[PDB]
Amino acid sequence: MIVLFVDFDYFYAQVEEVLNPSLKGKPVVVCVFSGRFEDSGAVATANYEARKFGVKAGIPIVEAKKILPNAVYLPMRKEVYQQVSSRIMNLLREYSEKIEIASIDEAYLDISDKVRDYREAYNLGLEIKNKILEKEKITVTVGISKNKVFAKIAADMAKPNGIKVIDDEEVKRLIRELDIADVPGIGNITAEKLKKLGINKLVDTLSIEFDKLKGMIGEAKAKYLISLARDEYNEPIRTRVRKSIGRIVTMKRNSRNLEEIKPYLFRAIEESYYKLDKRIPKAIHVVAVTEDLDIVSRGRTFPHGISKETAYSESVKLLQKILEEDERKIRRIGVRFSKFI
DNA sequence: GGGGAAGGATTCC
DNA sequence: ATGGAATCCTTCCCC
Ligand SMILES: [Ca+2]
Ligand SMILES: [Ca+2]
Ligand SMILES: [Ca+2]
Ligand SMILES: [Ca+2]
Ligand SMILES: [Ca+2]
């Protein structure tokens, strides 16, 4: 089994450059403005320029401006990046019938049957780099290995504009030499949990009682890490089927008043329903981020599919339930549909 | 013991 | 100190 994984590079920033070559060689920052005040909000992606100087996703815009007050600041245009993504996604279907589109900027293929060894795989990776660059002038990063996991890692090693195979020789090395928090699916929380069990490498999960591991990180997380460690992770490249759809917006000022939050919830419903795209949900959820950024949700499932007037009048009832069952204020409010037909 | 729901929570990008 | 969706975990009723 051979997996080729593609991560487009610095994607929203990169698309903004193609539409406007003037931003070649300039630091570029793409953001989501709150409208809470002047420049309020966060960064979503920056290009390599702005990025090597500290500017990264997740950070407040004003902070990003204290670092590079002379870099370019762009309001994001999700629609645009989306379209470009699809076109590039299509370009990939030439190379395999076996494709997994993971996200707007990421996909896997299963080239096991098009390439004889890892050598032809590399060339293939170069054929696809050449192609996207020819058609859309977009640079991507290719990461080849023998499972979805090491493919992604290979790609994270060579990022950006790079390419990188990880043969079984290097896989075997990485299981005992790679920092365990560079494993996909291991964010800071799980990392500190793993540090406190002395597991700082993928193999260290082979010399610990399962029960003890299952105690710190749970059953499912355990199995996962052990499977890579014994080198038997075989998750097949299957097509993704959207399981849920929603929108969530940041309120200009924080509030507990039902009337003030009401319009935001309603906007979020209008976007979510339009995104549904001839799909009918049985399950609705109202999701709220509190003044201290704790997530609080209330939901409900229906034996039939949800109509938009029902969605309106049930979300008001769930939002009520939140303000009754919690005393914090709210800064973000949204809905999420799921359990389709 | 586990499936289905409802809520929390993590990590993904 | 923004937005998207997927997976799991914990707790509950129910078989
Ligand atoms: Ca990227
Ligand atoms: Ca990580
Ligand atoms: Ca909570
Ligand atoms: Ca109360
Ligand atoms: Ca990425």
Method for structure elucidation? X-ray
Point out the ligand nearest to the CA of residue A322. Answer: 4
Measured to protein CB atoms, the chain C nucleotides within 7 Å are 1-10
Domains belonging to chain A, first-starting first, are 2-10+78-166 (3.30.70.270), 11-77 (3.40.1170.60), 167-233 (1.10.150.20), 244-336 (3.30.1490.100)
Q: For residue A27, give every residue at least 6 positions away whose Cβ sits within 8 Å of its Cβ, in sequence order, or none.
A: A46, A47, A49, A50, A53, A55, A68, A70, A71, A72
The protein residues having their C-beta less than 5 angstroms from ligand 1 (an ion) are A 7, 11, 105
A105 among annotated binding-site residues = yes
Point out the ligand nearest to the CA of residue A15. Answer: 1
Provide the CA A267 to C1' B1 distance, Å, integer: 44
A100 by DSSP, 3-state: which?
Answer: strand
Question: Which residue numbers of A are catalytic?
Answer: 106
Alpha-carbon distances, residue A244 vs A39, A275, A307 (angstroms): 31, 10, 16
Q: Which of A298, A290, A289 is nearest to A336 (CA)?
A: A298
End-to-end CA distance of chain A: 34
Strand ranges inside chain A, DSSP E: 3-8, 28-33, 41-46, 72-75, 99-103, 106-109, 140-145, 163-165, 244-255, 283-290, 295-301, 330-338
- Which value in Å is the resolution of this experimental model? 2.9
* Nearest nucleic acid nucleotide to A182, CA to C1' distance: B11
Helix axes A11-18, A78-93, angle to 10 degrees: 100
Alpha-carbon distances, residue A179 vs A163, A167, A174, A212 (angstroms): 21, 18, 9, 21
Instruction: Show which residues sit with Cβ under 7 A of nucleic chain B.
Output: A 57-58, 102-106, 152, 184-191, 283, 294-301, 321
d(CA A27, CA A60): 17
Decide if A161 contacts A9 (C-beta within 8 A): yes
A308: left (phi over 0), alpha (psi -120 to 50) or beta: alpha
Cα R_g (chain A), whole angstroms: 23
The protein residues having their C-beta less than 5 angstroms from ligand 5 (an ion) are A 7
d(CA A9, CA A161): 7
In chain A, how long is the greatest CA-to-CA distance?
A: 64
Tell the burial category of A255 from Cβ atoms under 10 Å away from its Cβ (0-12, 13-18, 19+): middle
Tell the burial category of A271 from Cβ atoms under 10 Å away from its Cβ (0-12, 13-18, 19+): middle
A283 pairs with which residues across the strands?
A301, A338
A332 pairs with which residues across the strands?
A250, A289
